[PDB]
């Protein structure tokens, strides 16, 4: 299976100055639950943003840099390389990867951040005419997690 994994706000903002615009521990827990034991494919900027590979899963970085050879990270240099990766592969960002992959993926695991943030990078537009809502689950709020959010699993019709 090839899936997108993304958090975007009400206006599809995903990032600002190479980081997330929001602090939301529960979204990171969601990512952990979905992708542990599986594969993440990410662009070079996203990787440099996190700074090290995420534990307990295969981290794959897409870059044109032929000098890229980082411990605990597998590198790929083409979109076409993604299709040779076994198991459940999650397209992990950022904007460029999402734009390149949204027409190719089986499904999407979206965390809708129910706020309006300043962004400089965006998830591409999509329509529910093309995507069935397999599930929609409201995130629980508390002291550590104060921004309303909804976990959507969308499957291409
Ligand atoms: N909210 C979220 O779900 C989420 C998730 C991840 C990231 N983000 C945010 O997204 C933003 C970053 O997005 P971005 O678009 O600027 O960068 P990005 O997608 O993370 O990385 C862009 C880089 O990926 C590489 N790349 C992409 N397609 C390629 C291809 N076909 N062949 C070779 N290399 C390719 C290139 O690296 P080289 O220049 O080295 O060739 C390119 O410059 C940040 O603000 C970050 O915080 C948000
Ligand atoms: C680009 C900055 O994003 C991060 C920085 C730190 C951490 C820490 O776990 C996680 C993220 C992060 C959260 C994310 N959350 C969701 N729902 N989906 C993603 N595709 C995603 C990707 C990254 C990279």
Short mmCIF file of C-alpha atoms and ligand atoms in Angstrom, two decimals:
data_model
loop_
_atom_site.label_atom_id
_atom_site.label_comp_id
_atom_site.label_asym_id
_atom_site.label_seq_id
_atom_site.Cartn_x
_atom_site.Cartn_y
_atom_site.Cartn_z
CA UNK A 1 0.00 0.00 0.00
CA UNK A 2 1.14 3.52 -0.80
CA UNK A 3 -0.38 6.19 1.45
CA UNK A 4 -0.01 9.89 2.16
CA UNK A 5 0.44 10.95 5.77
CA UNK A 6 -0.09 14.66 6.44
CA UNK A 7 -1.27 17.27 8.97
CA UNK A 8 -2.82 20.35 7.36
CA UNK A 9 -4.88 23.25 8.69
CA UNK A 10 -8.24 24.67 7.55
CA UNK A 11 -6.52 26.38 4.58
CA UNK A 12 -4.18 23.43 3.85
CA UNK A 13 -1.12 25.02 5.42
CA UNK A 14 1.47 22.35 6.29
CA UNK A 15 4.60 24.29 7.25
CA UNK A 16 6.29 27.56 8.02
CA UNK A 17 10.05 28.19 7.88
CA UNK A 18 10.79 24.46 7.58
CA UNK A 19 8.89 23.48 10.71
CA UNK A 20 5.29 22.69 11.66
CA UNK A 21 3.22 25.80 12.46
CA UNK A 22 1.63 24.09 15.50
CA UNK A 23 2.59 22.21 18.63
CA UNK A 24 0.38 19.12 18.78
CA UNK A 25 1.83 16.10 20.65
CA UNK A 26 -1.16 13.89 19.77
CA UNK A 27 -0.45 14.23 16.03
CA UNK A 28 3.09 12.93 16.60
CA UNK A 29 1.62 9.98 18.54
CA UNK A 30 -0.72 9.33 15.58
CA UNK A 31 2.27 9.32 13.20
CA UNK A 32 4.10 6.93 15.55
CA UNK A 33 1.13 4.52 15.69
CA UNK A 34 0.60 4.46 11.90
CA UNK A 35 4.19 4.31 10.64
CA UNK A 36 6.18 2.34 13.27
CA UNK A 37 7.36 -0.86 11.61
CA UNK A 38 6.65 0.54 8.12
CA UNK A 39 8.34 2.94 5.66
CA UNK A 40 8.47 6.73 5.44
CA UNK A 41 9.45 8.49 2.22
CA UNK A 42 10.30 12.18 2.63
CA UNK A 43 11.89 15.06 0.76
CA UNK A 44 15.32 16.39 1.71
CA UNK A 45 14.00 19.52 3.45
CA UNK A 46 11.64 17.49 5.61
CA UNK A 47 14.49 15.24 6.59
CA UNK A 48 16.79 18.13 7.48
CA UNK A 49 13.86 19.56 9.53
CA UNK A 50 13.61 16.44 11.73
CA UNK A 51 17.42 16.21 11.75
CA UNK A 52 17.63 12.43 12.35
CA UNK A 53 15.62 9.42 11.12
CA UNK A 54 12.52 8.48 13.10
CA UNK A 55 13.09 5.33 15.19
CA UNK A 56 11.62 1.87 14.51
CA UNK A 57 10.75 2.32 10.84
CA UNK A 58 12.50 2.59 7.50
CA UNK A 59 13.37 6.20 6.66
CA UNK A 60 13.78 6.93 2.96
CA UNK A 61 14.92 10.37 1.78
CA UNK A 62 14.31 11.67 -1.75
CA UNK A 63 17.02 14.08 -2.94
CA UNK A 64 19.04 14.99 -6.04
CA UNK A 65 22.18 15.15 -3.85
CA UNK A 66 24.43 12.29 -4.95
CA UNK A 67 26.62 12.96 -1.92
CA UNK A 68 23.71 12.15 0.41
CA UNK A 69 24.66 9.11 2.46
CA UNK A 70 23.35 9.36 6.01
CA UNK A 71 23.44 6.65 8.72
CA UNK A 72 20.06 4.96 9.33
CA UNK A 73 18.59 6.55 6.21
CA UNK A 74 18.08 5.01 2.80
CA UNK A 75 18.37 7.44 -0.09
CA UNK A 76 16.45 7.50 -3.37
CA UNK A 77 16.90 9.91 -6.29
CA UNK A 78 13.68 9.45 -8.27
CA UNK A 79 9.93 9.26 -7.67
CA UNK A 80 9.99 5.97 -9.61
CA UNK A 81 12.20 4.49 -6.83
CA UNK A 82 9.25 4.75 -4.42
CA UNK A 83 7.33 1.98 -6.26
CA UNK A 84 10.14 -0.56 -5.58
CA UNK A 85 9.91 -0.14 -1.80
CA UNK A 86 8.18 -3.14 -0.18
CA UNK A 87 5.47 -3.08 2.50
CA UNK A 88 3.34 -0.16 3.60
CA UNK A 89 4.95 3.05 2.35
CA UNK A 90 3.87 6.45 3.70
CA UNK A 91 4.58 9.61 1.74
CA UNK A 92 5.70 11.81 4.66
CA UNK A 93 6.15 15.25 3.02
CA UNK A 94 6.83 17.96 2.44
CA UNK A 95 4.93 20.16 -0.02
CA UNK A 96 6.93 19.02 -3.03
CA UNK A 97 6.50 15.30 -2.31
CA UNK A 98 2.77 15.72 -1.63
CA UNK A 99 2.27 17.59 -4.92
CA UNK A 100 4.18 14.86 -6.76
CA UNK A 101 2.30 11.96 -5.11
CA UNK A 102 -1.30 12.95 -4.41
CA UNK A 103 -2.47 11.57 -7.78
CA UNK A 104 -0.55 8.29 -7.23
CA UNK A 105 -1.39 7.17 -3.68
CA UNK A 106 -4.03 4.60 -2.59
CA UNK A 107 -5.24 6.55 0.43
CA UNK A 108 -4.44 9.43 2.75
CA UNK A 109 -4.14 9.68 6.54
CA UNK A 110 -4.83 13.35 7.20
CA UNK A 111 -4.82 15.19 10.49
CA UNK A 112 -7.00 18.23 9.90
CA UNK A 113 -5.73 20.97 12.20
CA UNK A 114 -8.94 22.96 12.88
CA UNK A 115 -7.27 26.38 12.98
CA UNK A 116 -5.81 29.00 10.61
CA UNK A 117 -2.02 29.34 10.83
CA UNK A 118 0.60 31.41 8.99
CA UNK A 119 2.16 29.07 6.39
CA UNK A 120 4.67 29.16 3.58
CA UNK A 121 3.98 25.63 2.35
CA UNK A 122 0.68 23.88 1.54
CA UNK A 123 -0.93 20.54 0.88
CA UNK A 124 -2.41 20.53 -2.65
CA UNK A 125 -6.20 21.02 -3.10
CA UNK A 126 -8.32 17.86 -3.18
CA UNK A 127 -12.05 17.15 -3.30
CA UNK A 128 -14.23 14.65 -1.37
CA UNK A 129 -15.79 13.79 -4.72
CA UNK A 130 -12.62 11.77 -5.33
CA UNK A 131 -12.12 10.41 -1.79
CA UNK A 132 -14.29 8.24 0.44
CA UNK A 133 -14.16 8.91 4.19
CA UNK A 134 -13.09 5.53 5.59
CA UNK A 135 -13.02 7.09 9.06
CA UNK A 136 -13.19 10.49 10.78
CA UNK A 137 -12.17 10.68 14.42
CA UNK A 138 -12.10 13.82 16.56
CA UNK A 139 -8.82 14.28 18.40
CA UNK A 140 -9.01 14.55 22.15
CA UNK A 141 -8.02 17.89 23.68
CA UNK A 142 -6.23 18.61 26.94
CA UNK A 143 -3.54 20.86 28.45
CA UNK A 144 -0.83 19.47 26.11
CA UNK A 145 -3.12 19.35 23.03
CA UNK A 146 -5.23 22.45 22.76
CA UNK A 147 -5.89 22.84 19.02
CA UNK A 148 -8.97 20.95 17.74
CA UNK A 149 -8.05 18.33 15.18
CA UNK A 150 -9.62 15.47 13.27
CA UNK A 151 -7.98 12.29 12.01
CA UNK A 152 -9.33 11.45 8.54
CA UNK A 153 -8.61 8.30 6.58
CA UNK A 154 -9.54 8.90 2.93
CA UNK A 155 -9.52 6.21 0.26
CA UNK A 156 -9.50 7.03 -3.46
CA UNK A 157 -12.88 6.26 -5.05
N1 LIG B 1 2.33 19.21 8.22
C1 LIG B 1 2.93 18.18 7.59
O1 LIG B 1 2.23 17.03 7.41
C2 LIG B 1 4.30 18.23 7.01
C3 LIG B 1 5.04 17.08 6.70
C4 LIG B 1 6.36 17.19 6.20
C5 LIG B 1 6.88 18.45 5.96
N2 LIG B 1 6.11 19.56 6.27
C6 LIG B 1 6.59 20.91 5.99
O2 LIG B 1 6.77 20.95 4.59
C7 LIG B 1 7.72 22.00 4.35
C8 LIG B 1 8.82 21.44 3.45
O3 LIG B 1 8.29 21.15 2.17
P1 LIG B 1 9.17 21.46 0.85
O4 LIG B 1 8.35 21.19 -0.35
O5 LIG B 1 9.81 22.79 1.01
O6 LIG B 1 10.32 20.36 0.88
P2 LIG B 1 10.36 18.77 0.91
O7 LIG B 1 9.27 18.25 0.05
O8 LIG B 1 10.45 18.23 2.28
O9 LIG B 1 11.80 18.59 0.22
C9 LIG B 1 12.04 19.18 -1.04
C10 LIG B 1 13.28 18.50 -1.56
O10 LIG B 1 12.96 17.14 -1.79
C11 LIG B 1 13.75 16.68 -2.87
N3 LIG B 1 12.92 16.15 -3.96
C12 LIG B 1 11.55 16.23 -4.11
N4 LIG B 1 11.19 15.58 -5.25
C13 LIG B 1 12.32 15.11 -5.84
C14 LIG B 1 12.55 14.39 -7.01
N5 LIG B 1 11.53 14.05 -7.81
N6 LIG B 1 13.85 14.04 -7.35
C15 LIG B 1 14.89 14.38 -6.53
N7 LIG B 1 14.66 15.10 -5.37
C16 LIG B 1 13.40 15.45 -5.03
C17 LIG B 1 14.62 17.84 -3.33
O11 LIG B 1 15.81 17.78 -2.57
P3 LIG B 1 17.21 18.39 -3.11
O12 LIG B 1 17.08 19.88 -3.25
O13 LIG B 1 18.27 17.99 -2.08
O14 LIG B 1 17.43 17.73 -4.47
C18 LIG B 1 13.77 19.02 -2.90
O15 LIG B 1 14.46 20.25 -2.83
C19 LIG B 1 8.27 22.47 5.70
O16 LIG B 1 7.63 23.66 6.16
C20 LIG B 1 7.91 21.33 6.62
O17 LIG B 1 7.75 21.76 7.97
C21 LIG B 1 4.85 19.48 6.75
C1 LIG B 2 8.71 19.13 8.97
C2 LIG B 2 8.52 19.15 10.46
O1 LIG B 2 7.59 18.12 10.86
C3 LIG B 2 7.86 17.39 11.98
C4 LIG B 2 8.84 17.75 12.92
C5 LIG B 2 9.06 16.95 14.04
C6 LIG B 2 8.35 15.77 14.27
C7 LIG B 2 8.63 14.95 15.48
O2 LIG B 2 8.17 13.82 15.62
C8 LIG B 2 7.38 15.36 13.36
C9 LIG B 2 7.10 16.15 12.24
C10 LIG B 2 6.08 15.64 11.30
C11 LIG B 2 4.75 15.46 11.69
C12 LIG B 2 3.86 14.94 10.76
N1 LIG B 2 2.55 14.75 11.07
C13 LIG B 2 1.67 14.22 10.18
N2 LIG B 2 0.38 14.06 10.59
N3 LIG B 2 2.04 13.85 8.94
C14 LIG B 2 3.32 14.01 8.48
N4 LIG B 2 3.69 13.67 7.24
C15 LIG B 2 4.33 14.57 9.41
C16 LIG B 2 5.66 14.73 9.01
C17 LIG B 2 6.55 15.26 9.94
C18 LIG B 2 7.99 15.43 9.50
#
